[PDB]
């Protein structure tokens, strides 16, 4: 398992001076979701393109997802899969040139699980408990739900942040009530890993580079996995 964070490993919202609404955006009732799809194209060797239509607005009809490498893309290319992840538009490119708008398209990382045999007997959902710690005190717990036996850390991370934006103002348009935050996952076999929840310091937030951490397409057993969200206040 990955070593837990020391305070110096964690981004601080106090050191970020841009618009925290750009981070909020990525997690606030925001996700690509599709069931039983197969990729239809690609751009580079490490990515897959799906015909998925925006159900909310009409921002896209195609979603490109990038995977860590070409061999991860080959794993899923011809498979019938489900897709769940957080998409972006700024710097969502389908060629080499910077600054190009690609109408009808959106981009994301990872988010792919094989469809067949990954679902529950009926219209049944699996609950995963999230324990939230504020300044080391477990003040709040809740469950997120998934239709999947093997679910990406990304999908659970999203559902957890979405709940917390709505109940605890995790991210707000200008800043956050929190100084640091990380989400740690604890697997059945003792393996743990975590993601920093705050933007890198500075005046700007690159959404694409932030989400790229999902490109490993890390999956967990939704039945046995544990999630802790650890926050400190300003």
């Amino acid at each position: 398992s990955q070593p837990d964070p020391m305070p110096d490993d964690l981004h601080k919202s106090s050191e970020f001076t841009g618009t925290m609404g750009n981070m909020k955006y990525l997690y606030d009732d925001h996700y690509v979701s599709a069931t039983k799809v197969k990729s239809v194209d690609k751009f580079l060797a490490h990515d897959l393109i799906y015909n998925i239509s925006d159900k909310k607005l009409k921002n896209y009809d195609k979603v490109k997802t990038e995977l860590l490498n070409e061999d991860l893309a080959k794993k899923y290319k011809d498979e019938v899969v489900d897709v769940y992840g957080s998409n972006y538009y700024v710097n969502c490119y389908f060629s080499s040139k910077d600054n190009v708008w690609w109408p009808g398209k959106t981009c994301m990382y990872g988010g792919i699980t094989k469809h067949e045999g990954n679902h529950f007997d009926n219209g049944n959902l699996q609950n995963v408990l999230v324990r939230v710690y504020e300044n080391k005190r477990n003040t709040i717990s809740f469950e997120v739900q998934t239709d999947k036996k093997s679910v990406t850390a990304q999908e659970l991370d999203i559902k957890a942040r979405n709940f917390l934006i709505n109940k605890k103002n995790l991210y707000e348009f200008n800043s956050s009530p929190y100084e640091t935050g990380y989400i740690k996952f604890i697997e059945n076999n003792g393996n743990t890993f975590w993601y920093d929840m705050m933007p890198a310091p500075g005046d700007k937030f690159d959404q694409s580079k932030y989400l790229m951490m999902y490109n490993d397409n890390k999956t967990v057993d939704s039945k046995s996995v544990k999630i802790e969200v650890h926050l400190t206040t300003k």
Binding site: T19, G21, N22, Y25, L57, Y88, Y89, V90, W101, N174
Partner: protein, 109 residues
């Protein structure tokens, strides 16, 4: 027209939530919200480089903004104050072009 903003005229009471909407039809990458001192210049509140993204201009305080799609950029006064009384201009820009909306006159009494 290139950029249409609405409402064109709005009178609001202190503390009401005011939203100004702006829609463009040429689908340029950049959208901007300015307010005009009047007898003076345009001052940048917020702008975006694309859907899902906004950045602070020179005078962001007291305004939020949302770019929910390429064509739409809205300015949000959560709690309207009388200092927010003025004229508001939406702009869209890109590919060596810059277009303006017709202006929103907002008065907060």
């Amino acid at each position: 027209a290139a950029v249409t903003q609405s409402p064109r005229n709005k009178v609001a009471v202190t503390g009401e939530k005011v939203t100004l909407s702006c829609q463009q039809t040429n689908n340029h990458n950049n959208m901007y919200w300015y307010r005009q001192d009047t007898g003076h210049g345009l001052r940048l509140i917020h702008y975006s480089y694309g859907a899902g993204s906004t950045e602070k201009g020179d005078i962001p305080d007291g305004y939020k903004a949302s770019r929910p799609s390429q064509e739409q950029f809205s300015l949000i006064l959560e709690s309207a104050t009388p200092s927010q009384t003025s004229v508001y201009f939406c702009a869209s820009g890109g590919g060596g072009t810059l277009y303006f909306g017709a202006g929103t006159r907002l008065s907060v009494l």
